[PDB]
Amino acid sequence: SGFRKMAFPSGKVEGCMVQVTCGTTTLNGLWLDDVVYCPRHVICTSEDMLNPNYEDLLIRKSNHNFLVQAGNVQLRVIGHSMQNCVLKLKVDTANPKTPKYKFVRIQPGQTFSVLACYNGSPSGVYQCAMRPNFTIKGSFLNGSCGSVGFNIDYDCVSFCYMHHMELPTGVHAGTDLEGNFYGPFVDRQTAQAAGTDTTITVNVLAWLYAAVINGDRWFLNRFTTTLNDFNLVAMKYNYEPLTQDHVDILGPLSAQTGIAVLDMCASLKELLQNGMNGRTILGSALLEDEFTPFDVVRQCS
Amino acid sequence: SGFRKMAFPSGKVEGCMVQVTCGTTTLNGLWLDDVVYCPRHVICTSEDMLNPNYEDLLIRKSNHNFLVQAGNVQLRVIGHSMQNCVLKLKVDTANPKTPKYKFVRIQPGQTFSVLACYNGSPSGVYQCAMRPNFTIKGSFLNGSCGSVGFNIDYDCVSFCYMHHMELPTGVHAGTDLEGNFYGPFVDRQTAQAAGTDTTITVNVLAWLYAAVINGDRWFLNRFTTTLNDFNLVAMKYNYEPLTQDHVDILGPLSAQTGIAVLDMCASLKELLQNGMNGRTILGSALLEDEFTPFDVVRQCS
Numbered sequence: 259s260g261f262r263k264m265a266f267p268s269g270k271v272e273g274c275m276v277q278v279t280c281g282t283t284t285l286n287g288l289w290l291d292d293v294v295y296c297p298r299h300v301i302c303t304s305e306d307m308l309n310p311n312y313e314d315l316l317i318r319k320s321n322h323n324f325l326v327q328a329g330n331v332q333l334r335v336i337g338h339s340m341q342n343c344v345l346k347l348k349v350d351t352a353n354p355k356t357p358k359y360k361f362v363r364i365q366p367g368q369t370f371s372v373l374a375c376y377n378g379s380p381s382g383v384y385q386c387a388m389r390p391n392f393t394i395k396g397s398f399l400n401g402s403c404g405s406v407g408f409n410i411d412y413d414c415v416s417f418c419y420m421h422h423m424e425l426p427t428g429v430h431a432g433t434d435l436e437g438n439f440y441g442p443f444v445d446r447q448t449a450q451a452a453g454t455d456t457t458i459t460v461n462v463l464a465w466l467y468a469a470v471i472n473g474d475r476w477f478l479n480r481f482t483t484t485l486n487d488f489n490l491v492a493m494k495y496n497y498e499p500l501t502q503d504h505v506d507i508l509g510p511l512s513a514q515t516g517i518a519v520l521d522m523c524a525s526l527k528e529l530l531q532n533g534m535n536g537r538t539i540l541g542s543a544l545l546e547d548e549f550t551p552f553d554v555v556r557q558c559s
Numbered sequence: 560s561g562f563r564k565m566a567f568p569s570g571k572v573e574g575c576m577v578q579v580t581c582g583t584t585t586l587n588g589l590w591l592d593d594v595v596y597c598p599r600h601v602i603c604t605s606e607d608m609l610n611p612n613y614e615d616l617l618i619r620k621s622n623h624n625f626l627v628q629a630g631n632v633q634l635r636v637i638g639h640s641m642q643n644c645v646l647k648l649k650v651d652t653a654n655p656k657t658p659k660y661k662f663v664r665i666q667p668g669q670t671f672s673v674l675a676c677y678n679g680s681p682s683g684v685y686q687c688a689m690r691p692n693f694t695i696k697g698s699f700l701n702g703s704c705g706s707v708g709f710n711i712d713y714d715c716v717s718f719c720y721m722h723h724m725e726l727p728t729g730v731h732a733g734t735d736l737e738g739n740f741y742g743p744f745v746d747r748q749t750a751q752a753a754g755t756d757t758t759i760t761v762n763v764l765a766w767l768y769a770a771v772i773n774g775d776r777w778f779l780n781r782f783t784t785t786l787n788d789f790n791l792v793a794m795k796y797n798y799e800p801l802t803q804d805h806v807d808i809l810g811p812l813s814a815q816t817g818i819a820v821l822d823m824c825a826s827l828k829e830l831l832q833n834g835m836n837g838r839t840i841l842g843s844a845l846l847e848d849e850f851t852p853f854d855v856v857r858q859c860s
């Protein structure tokens with residue numbers, strides 16, 4: 259027992275991280291087969307960062323404008339192109355450590371592991387969630403661009419995130435591996451702000467279940483709510499609406515614990531209205547929303 | 560910006576995890592060079608559980624009584640010995656993925672990463688701390704024994720923890736890689752309990768410094784404290800004593816923020832007295848004690 263924020267093992271991804279240099283910009287690249295993926299802003303200098311014309315910055319460049327370095331060794335760049343906000347550099351050598359992989363785009367509410375990297379070297383791994391406002395609450399410093407987020411299913415690495423930027427509130431934005439942003443953001447040095455965030459209701463409920471499973475039960479009551487009454491309360495507290503699909507998804511945990519979802523919803527409604535009355539749930543004095551139902555099942559089995 | 564519970568990249572350790580079976584017992588082992596380390600209780604049957612004599616059980620075993628599997632490959636065992644509570648199995652193949660490593664024994668308050676494994680297969684990575692009562696608040700199920708805790712410093716893996724057991728309160732106990740337990744615990748199914756846990760004061764202080772570095776000052780106050788007065792108050796909330804050593808260790812963070820250590824102690828005393836009153840620090844509504852000064856420096860700007 260016990261319940262922790264857990265990331266996937268990161269070895270398969272560490273084997274793919276490289277350093278990409280263009281002029282005096284350095285950041286991280288993902289090396290899969292014979293192509294390296296990195297943010298397109300690598301080709302941008304500070305003079306242009308304010309209002310970059312990527313087409314024009316790229317047209318001016320050749321293979322020899324990029325240097326790719328995997329640990330000790332230079333990879334020779336033999337082609338280059340851009341897909342949305344990602345630069346693709348073709349190299350003369352396939353990565354022998356390439357895992358079975360897919361590129362997937364995730365939905366808000368879904369979680370993934372981030373391997374934070376600097377100068378092409380993996381430095382730490384943590385778990386986070388795609389927020390409803392399409393940011394992530396990461397931990398990222400200068401040089402972290404091109405770090406990736408991933409999930410693992412079987413032996414297959416699903417890459418879902420590449421890091422591009424930080425917003426004024428201190429949260430992070432990036433793209434999928436095909437270079438489409440999550441959220442209404444652009445890759446230029448300009449004032450941009452995240453929309454009001456909301457809480458991921460379904461995840462909170464999942465985590466309440468994990469709490470029950472670990473013997474934290476003080477927040478249960480005899481009562482039950484409806485979906486419609488619950489959503490009225492949710493709306494009030496900037497929680498995402500709970501849909502019938504969410505209810506379905508929690509079916510396993512509901513049957514496992516003997517607490518019906520609309521019962522858990524009544525608990526959660528009470529917690530929103532009254533607070534925790536000085537108590538904690540799973541070592542937390544706030545309602546945690548970065549664990550999915552699947553994560554809860556994964557860890558509790 | 561941002562601050563996250565961050566683990567070390569697990570790849571170097573993933574390449575060392577194997578499965579060890581003896582009789583009907585299967586658990587995890589750590590394959591370094593031509594040695595597999597695992598908990599000695601792998602040789603205990605369901606009858607031996609209360610008062611096993613491990614020396615007596617081991618002398619009855621042949622090399623061929625132990626099955627070691629790495630992926631699909633059987634490793635032939637060609638020798639065995641016991642050191643304290645760890646079994647060492649000599650195998651005929653040195654692990655080609657052996658990283659640079661050391662074995663270290665850590666002290667209460669120190670943090671490390673855990674690679675949770677089942678059947679020799681890594682399933683997740685998380686960060687935790689050696690509690691003052693010599694337990695860790697892990698997340699482990701049946702079959703997790705042999706999972707290890709580690710730090711990485713400059714490509715060198717410091718292994719500091721091997722998982723052996725769970726206590727009644729749901730927390731976890733184990734040994735260093737020389738097989739000495741942390742704490743008074745024993746590898747027997749006899750009645751054992753964790754002593755009262757206390758908060759790692761030096762770590763809470765470090766984490767307040769992290770909050771300042773990250774741009775939040777709301778909890779500071781105009782006061783200072785003597786070290787003695789600090790301890791007399793903090794111990795009333797079950798916090799560990801802060802020592803002159805701790806104070807020296809916080810000097811770097813003191814210098815970067817310009818807040819004297821004793822001033823930060825005054826801030827903590829007030830937090831303990833007042834609570835958060837609806838506010839958070841670094842995303843948390845309680846005082847986090849599982850980041851060391853070193854962890855904060857590592858992760859922070």
Ligand SMILES: CC(C)[C@@H](NC(=O)C(F)(F)F)C(=O)N[C@@H]1CN(C(=O)c2cncc3cccnc23)CC[C@H]1c1cc(F)cc(Cl)c1
Binds near residue numbers: 310424
């Ligand atoms: C409005 C945003 C575009 C901007 N935001 C801010 O500067 C602010 F205000 F939020 F800090 C931003 O993230 N600029 C990045 C910063 N950077 C990093 O390595 C970096 C990454 N993650 C967190 C950090 C924390 C501290 C310092 N650095 C980082 C280098 C590349 C640069 C960039 C990205 C891009 F997509 C397009 C262009 Cl042209 C330039």
Ligand SMILES: CC(C)[C@@H](NC(=O)C(F)(F)F)C(=O)N[C@@H]1CN(C(=O)c2cncc3cccnc23)CC[C@H]1c1cc(F)cc(Cl)c1
Binds near residue numbers: 699723725
């Ligand atoms: C007093 C403790 C010795 C005992 N715990 C209790 O009795 C308590 F307190 F949990 F009820 C305990 O941990 N037994 C372990 C359990 N185990 C696990 O795989 C295991 C590991 N981590 C978490 C789990 C969570 C759920 C189920 N299993 C696990 C198999 C091996 C066994 C063992 C270890 C040992 F060192 C000596 C002997 Cl002879 C037997």
